[PDB]
Write a protein that binds this ligand. Structure first.
Ligand SMILES: Nc1nc2c(ncn2[C@@H]2O[C@H](COP(=O)(O)OP(=O)(O)OP(=O)(O)O)[C@@H](O)[C@H]2O)c(=O)[nH]1
Ligand SMILES: Nc1nc2c(ncn2[C@@H]2O[C@H](COP(=O)(O)OP(=O)(O)O)[C@@H](O)[C@H]2O)c(=O)[nH]1
Ligand SMILES: [Mg+2]
Ligand SMILES: [Mg+2]
Lengths: 428, 433, 487
């Protein structure tokens, strides 16, 4: 359990993936040239996880059927650091079709990716797991991504499969087949990934609009919250911590039931792009803003469900004793929103190094039953179109049978019912 | 004579560090394994150390982990030259707080290598006495791999005794949710292989450090140094000679009335921080052995019945002062013995002062005492584990992880049935006739 | 552990003696070469003198059950046994202070005596023991000596006068012994000699040399004996005494229908071309037929282009429609896949079991079932076992399920010794155990069935040997399927 192989697929996958590598390369003191220019040695203590040795190069693979984002990433600020051979980009696109990426033109390219996946895996002393960034409402990241997951699953059945899946919403993209793609993709993640961070774009939009007070949010405004959230939920993996050190230990503490591995991430404080928020929030503030709905990266109210498991990560120099008092308080004061039949389900870690720009931050990771609201929302949009069989010729023309839609819809509603099932279970 | 110490997992390895550091301080051994010339001299401590031809004293210890991270610090820190590198065994992939990984999947890859390096030490001994296993209850290696090693030692070294110092979990420092699962699973498969088991509730050591040392949030170093003090007092009978220094194997004959009732309760005193000026008498440190705030497993012996009571004194301690204190406590406290026990106290004395880590958080004391009592009240610890176990297992939460690593789900049921019988066995023993 | 019968530690020796006692009671009677404890009798002659009185007692009860086990023809080798065994039995078995250790040693001396032809080649060995320092030894083996005469008696012994005089020599010394028990047990031996002969004899030879109080006791003992002057029957016999179809359809030809735009299209970088090329010959050429031409038609050229897309084509859609054609071929071509046709598609189907889409796994399995119904275990058995040990967990569960399918419809030709039996434990039960002990639950669940489906065919006691190496838990999940499984 050491090295993590990172993969980004599709348009959104390579967007938030490149922005994530910019963030952690700075926190680890790595300039675009690949050299280390940091100061502390804790930055190099567990650099072997995400990077390799040079002469430091990211252990990342970039995949997309459309070569458009291939050049947008290489032209980016950190585009010169990625391995040239790790770019696996096909000829034609996916047309925002899950079936084109999963069955048709993504399967024609997936073998090229597994060759690069194998390459980075052979040079690993002990492969810890995999990490995927993609969008469920797209075509390549949704379709070809879930195919890559199921392919990695059959070739690395002993490694953890972790994903950063973003959720489609009408408030962002106006493509109508996104409920189809997300339903077909959720149908895969529930049976293939060991853990999945749900990144709702409807939540990201509502945050930039109603909290950061931005009238017209752009993708850079949305991807800023994503990169911050990704940096927090990965803090314990790249810095020498005691709790939830590797991928499996985190999944063993966060996933009580195999299909219920969909996490609701949170982060505080909610900063803007290059704005001014100097005064490091107090520990009681970081705790109150962590357990609210206005800082969740998923359009779900934690009041509507119960927390099965919780992982909190504080960053920056602070009183560890003052953290315990707050984390204890929010538990015994809101005990109804925490599962009783899982003792000590909340786990808090501390890291001295804050993210660049802040002195105190706190990242939330929750396995709440309220995440069923997110699936209820997608399942409602799915059926509205599916009852009229609109745009179904897209997927049937690529080989999919109409029954596949009914099954993916059924298994999602089963996942919703199960999240409600343990929301009603008691101790007695 | 000789005793081979085995340290499994992070807890076992990190505690062995604080223990062997204290062992070296007590015996005057330097980190390079060298000692001054005798200038005979009563040099008992060879039960825990071997001698190189070049005059180097090497611990009879094995450090095992499924991950190199912890033991790498050992073969890098101050005592890198103390151990032979053949005694520091590591894997690459750990058990991820999963008993089934440490016992079935990952642990079986390295079990043959560990037993080989142990046979090396066993073949360097003229007369082996037994094994001292150091492990946790919650970690995957400390629970899974330890119980695997205990099964194999009973097959190979069947005659030899095996003692374990187990780290009872506590939420204050708990690094895993499934720790009650691992605790029940390892207590079940090790119950018929262990001769004596000294549990160490991390909550007790955590609170004793907060109360008596005035440490806000104790680190693992604080807990380990306090634990190493107790482990030293228990093993001091084997490592030193003394006219009144009763051997530990003579205490086990009184502490274990039945094979399954082999969980004594250790109570150490005095624990004083190095901040102000203090000297406690024999009667005061003997009184402190019956204050549950000084125990290493949280439970109330007044709510139970004793089967044995052993006082391991070390320091400036005179026998007549002991019997005077015992007679006072026996007629001014409520020590309930079962009606089939002799009601007597077994006393051992070691006139060497208690050693502490220099510049540490524990103060050097003139005299100290470690009480080993076999009371039914320790079954309260099993109840706290069995309860957290029952809450999750009734929903089969986290079970798929174990079943996904070679373990049949029915082994959960078997292990819980054994803990249910173990709680009945403690209930039945305390009844009169 | 057979050599641990002389291990240093006693508990290991005690275990081997119990293991031996089970072998001699649970083995064959015709016997194993492993039961070679006749021809090296120094083995048990060493066990009887075990330095540990507890394990020594178990070495004797094991020697006892062995000693009655050997009561099976042709073991006339009982002459070598008495010489090597009853001196250790007398010196440290009858002399033992343990009532159980001594009771079984007397029971072994009885068996070794009836293995003989008479009592003389047993009396001569324990006669020196009558002059031992330890009175408890001479107290015990004069009682034994008296009970080998009471039950066996003097029959078929070469010279009785040399044997009578040999056993009557120490009797005056024994009846004046300091020990009260040695005297008492000698008076009982005199009664046994009295019972086989008269009173006239041992008054001529013996009774005059005893204390008058003693020969008065014997007179009282002779009065209390009611039986005839010699017993009209031996209370115990020696061993040698107890012995002596609607498939008349016209075969249609379909290898002509293949259009020219096929081998080019089926080998195209466009998936649509490969899908449509396979689908047209499936729906238009293979679908509307039921009986293909068995003679003068080499389908091997067509079968290998199906295996090429099954094994290597990334389009899972074509893999489905191609495997279906394989199923249709071997269905409509009964008794056709002799070797080349059956093998050209078998291993590509097994490799492609990795696909998890239910429609695809359905197509590949049904073709694997269809090739198995006409090639039972030609390559299948040997090739299926190879892919149960494959690195991918999905191909492990599917190939294991596939064996269960063939195993269910296993009718064979008979009578016995088929390819399955000779591979039962050398390879087949070993490959199933790997599935039974797999890390994943659903995988083990397949092996539990596959093992139970195996116990359904061959007697459940034949596989009890590998069943005991398994967990008691895995035994209950295997017995679980045994109730549900049939055929
Ligand atoms: N007193 C004390 N307890 C410790 C220490 N290290 C770990 N523990 C306890 O051990 C439990 C977890 O077991 P570990 O030993 O850390 O895990 P492990 O044995 O390495 O097994 P894996 O990590 O799963 O491979 C936790 O409840 C901790 O409280 C230590 O240094 N001192
Ligand atoms: N947060 C975020 N979402 C994005 C971004 N780009 C695309 N998306 C979302 O992804 C969905 C479209 O998927 P896309 O990545 O463009 O197609 P793909 O190339 O086949 O994976 C839409 O619903 C968008 O909301 C981005 O930069 N940030
Ligand atoms: Mg888009
Ligand atoms: Mg560890």
């Amino acid at each position: 359990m050491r090295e993590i192989v990172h993969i980004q697929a599709g348009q959104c996958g390579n967007q938030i993936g490149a922005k994530f590598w910019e963030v952690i390369s700075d926190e680890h003191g790595i300039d675009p040239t690949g050299s280390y220019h940091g100061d502390s040695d804790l930055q190099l203590e567990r650099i072997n996880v995400y990077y390799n040795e040079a002469a430091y190069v990211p252990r990342a693979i970039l995949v997309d059927l459309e070569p458009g984002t291939m050049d947008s990433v290489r032209s980016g600020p950190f585009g010169q650091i990625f391995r040239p051979d790790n770019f696996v980009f096909g000829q034609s696109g996916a047309g925002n079709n899950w079936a084109k990426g999963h069955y048709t033109e993504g399967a024609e390219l997936v073998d090229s990716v597994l060759d690069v996946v194998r390459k980075e895996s052979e040079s690993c002393d002990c492969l810890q797991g995999f990490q995927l960034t993609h969008s469920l409402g797209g075509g390549t990241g949704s379709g070809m991504g879930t195919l890559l997951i199921s392919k990695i699953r059959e070739e690395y059945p002993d490694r953890i499969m972790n994903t950063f899946s973003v959720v489609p919403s009408p408030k962002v993209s106006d493509t109508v087949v996104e409920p189809y793609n997300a339903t077909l993709s959720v149908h895969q993640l529930v049976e293939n990934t060991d853990e999945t961070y749900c990144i709702d774009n409807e939540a990201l939009y509502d945050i930039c609009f109603r909290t950061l007070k931005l009238t017209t949010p752009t993708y850079g405004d949305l991807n800023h919250l994503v990169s911050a959230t990704m940096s927090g939920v990965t803090t314990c993996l790249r810095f020498p911590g005691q709790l939830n050190a590797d991928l499996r230990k985190l999944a063993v503490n966060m996933v009580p039931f195999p299909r219920l591995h969909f996490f609701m991430p949170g982060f505080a404080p909610l900063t803007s792009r290059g704005s001014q928020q100097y005064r490091a929030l107090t520990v009681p503030e970081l705790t109150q803003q962590m357990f609210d709905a206005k800082n969740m990266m998923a359009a779900c109210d934690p009041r509507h469900g119960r927390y099965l498991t919780v992982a909190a990560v504080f960053r920056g120099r602070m009183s560890m004793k003052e953290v315990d008092e707050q984390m204890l308080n929010v538990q015994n004061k809101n005990s109804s929103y925490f599962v009783e039949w899982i003792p000590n389900n909340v786990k808090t870690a501390v890291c001295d190094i804050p993210p660049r720009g802040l002195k105190m931050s706190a990242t939330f990771i929750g396995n709440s039953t309220a995440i069923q609201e997110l699936f209820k929302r997608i399942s409602e949009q799915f059926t509205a179109m599916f009852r009229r069989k609109a745009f179904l010729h897209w997927y049937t023309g690529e080989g999919m049978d109409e029954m596949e839609f009914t099954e993916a819809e059924s298994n999602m509603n089963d996942l919703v019912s199960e999240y409600q099932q343990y929301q009603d279970a008691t101790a007695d | 004579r000789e005793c081979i110490s085995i340290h499994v997992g992070q807890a076992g390895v990190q505690i062995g560090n604080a223990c062997w550091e204290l062992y070296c301080l007590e015996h005057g051994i330097q980190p390079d394994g060298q000692m001054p010339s005798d200038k005979g001299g009563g040099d008992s401590f060879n039960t825990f150390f071997s001698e190189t031809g070049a005059g180097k004293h090497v611990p009879r210890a094995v450090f095992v982990d499924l991950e190199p991270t912890v033991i790498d610090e050992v073969r890098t820190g101050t005592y890198r030259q103390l151990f032979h590198p053949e005694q520091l065994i590591t894997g690459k992939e750990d058990a991820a707080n999963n008993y089934a990984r440490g016992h079935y999947t990952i642990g079986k890859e390295i079990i043959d290598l560990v037993l080989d390096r142990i046979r090396k030490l066993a073949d360097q001994c003229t007369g082996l006495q037994g094994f001292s296993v150091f492990h946790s209850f919650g970690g995957g290696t400390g629970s899974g791999f330890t119980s695997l090693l205990m099964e194999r030692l009973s097959v190979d070294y069947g005659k030899k005794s095996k003692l374990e110092f187990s780290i009872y979990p506590a939420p204050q420092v708990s690094t895993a949710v499934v720790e009650p699962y691992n605790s029940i699973l390892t207590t079940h498969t090790t119950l018929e292989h262990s001769d004596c088991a000294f549990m160490v509730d991390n909550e007790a050591i955590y609170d004793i450090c907060r109360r008596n040392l005035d440490i806000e949030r104790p680190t693992y170093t604080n807990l380990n140094r306090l634990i190493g003090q107790i482990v030293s007092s228990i093993t001091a009978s084997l490592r030193f000679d003394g006219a009144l220094n009763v051997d530990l194997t003579e205490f086990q004959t009184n502490l274990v009335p039945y094979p399954r009732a082999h969980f004594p309760l250790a109570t150490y005193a005095p624990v004083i921080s190095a901040e102000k000026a203090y000297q406690l008498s024999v009667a005061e440190i003997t009184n402190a052995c019956f204050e549950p705030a000084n125990q290493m497993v949280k439970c109330d012996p007044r709510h139970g019945k004793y089967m044995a009571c052993c006082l391991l004194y070390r320091g400036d301690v005179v026998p007549k002062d002991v019997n005077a204190a015992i007679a006072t406590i026996k007629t001014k406290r409520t020590i309930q013995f079962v009606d089939w026990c002799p009601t007597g106290f077994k006393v051992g004395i070691n006139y060497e002062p208690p050693t502490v880590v220099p510049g540490g958080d524990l103060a050097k004391v003139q005299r100290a005492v470690c009480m080993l009592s076999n009371t039914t009240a320790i079954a309260e610890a099993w109840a706290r584990l069995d309860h957290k176990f029952d809450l999750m297992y009734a929903k089969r939460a986290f079970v798929h992880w174990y079943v996904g690593e070679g373990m049949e789900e029915g082994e959960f049921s078997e292990a819980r049935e054994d803990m249910a019988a173990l709680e009945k066995d403690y209930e039945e023993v305390g009844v009169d006739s | 552990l057979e050599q641990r019968a002389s291990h240093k530690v006693w508990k290991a020796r005690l275990n081997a003696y119990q293991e031996l006692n089970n072998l001699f009671t649970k083995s064959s009677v015709i016997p194993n070469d492993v039961a070679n404890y006749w021809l090296d009798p120094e083995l048990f002659a060493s066990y009887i003198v075990d330095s540990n009185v507890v394990a020594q007692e178990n070495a004797i009860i094991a020697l006892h059950t062995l000693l009655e086990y050997i009561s099976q023809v042709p073991n006339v080798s009982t002459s070598k046994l008495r010489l090597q065994w009853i001196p250790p039995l007398v010196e440290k078995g009858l002399s033992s202070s343990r009532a159980a250790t001594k009771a079984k040693a007397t029971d072994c001396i009885m068996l070794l005596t009836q293995s003989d032809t008479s009592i003389q080649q047993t009396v001569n060995l324990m006669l020196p023991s009558l002059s031992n320092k330890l009175p408890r030894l001479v107290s015990s083996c004069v009682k034994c000596l008296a009970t080998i005469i009471e039950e066996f008696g003097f029959i078929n012994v070469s010279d009785i006068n040399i044997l009578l005089s040999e056993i009557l020599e120490p009797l005056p010394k024994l009846s004046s012994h300091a020990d009260r028990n040695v005297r008492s047990e000698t008076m009982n031996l005199i009664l046994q000699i009295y019972k086989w002969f008269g009173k006239e004899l041992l008054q001529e030879l013996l009774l005059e040399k005893l204390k008058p109080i003693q020969q008065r006791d014997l007179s009282r003992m002779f009065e209390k004996y009611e039986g005839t002057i010699p017993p009209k029957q031996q209370p115990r016999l020696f061993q040698w005494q107890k012995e002596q179809p609607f498939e008349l359809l016209p075969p249609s030809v379909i290898l002509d229908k293949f259009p020219a735009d096929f081998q080019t299209r089926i080998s195209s970088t466009k998936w649509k071309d490969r899908v449509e090329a396979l689908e047209e010959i499936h729906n238009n050429v293979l679908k509307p037929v039921k009986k293909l031409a068995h003679k003068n038609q080499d389908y091997s050229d067509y079968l290998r282009v199906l295996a090429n897309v099954i094994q290597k084509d990334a389009n899972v859609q074509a893999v489905t429609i191609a495997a279906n054609s394989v199923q249709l071929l071997c269905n409509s071509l009964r008794s056709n896949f002799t070797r080349s046709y059956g093998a050209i598609v078998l291993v590509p189907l097994l490799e492609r079991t990795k696909e998890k889409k239910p429609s695809v796994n359905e197509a590949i399995c049904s073709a694997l079932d269809a090739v198995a119904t006409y090639c039972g275990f030609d390559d299948c058995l040997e090739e299926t076992l190879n892919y149960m040990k494959h690195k991918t967990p999905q191909v492990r569960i599917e190939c294991t399920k596939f064996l269960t399918r063939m195993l269910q419809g296993w009718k064979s030709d008979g009578p016995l010794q088929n390819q399955l039996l000779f591979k039962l434990l050398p390879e087949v039960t070993t490959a199933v155990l790997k599935i039974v002990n797999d890390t994943q639950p659903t995988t083990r669940n397949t092996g539990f069935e596959c093992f139970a489906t195996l116990m359904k065919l061959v007697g459940e006691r034949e596989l009890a040997d590998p069943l005991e190496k398994l967990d008691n838990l895995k035994k209950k999940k295997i017995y679980e399927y045994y109730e549900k499984v049939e055929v």
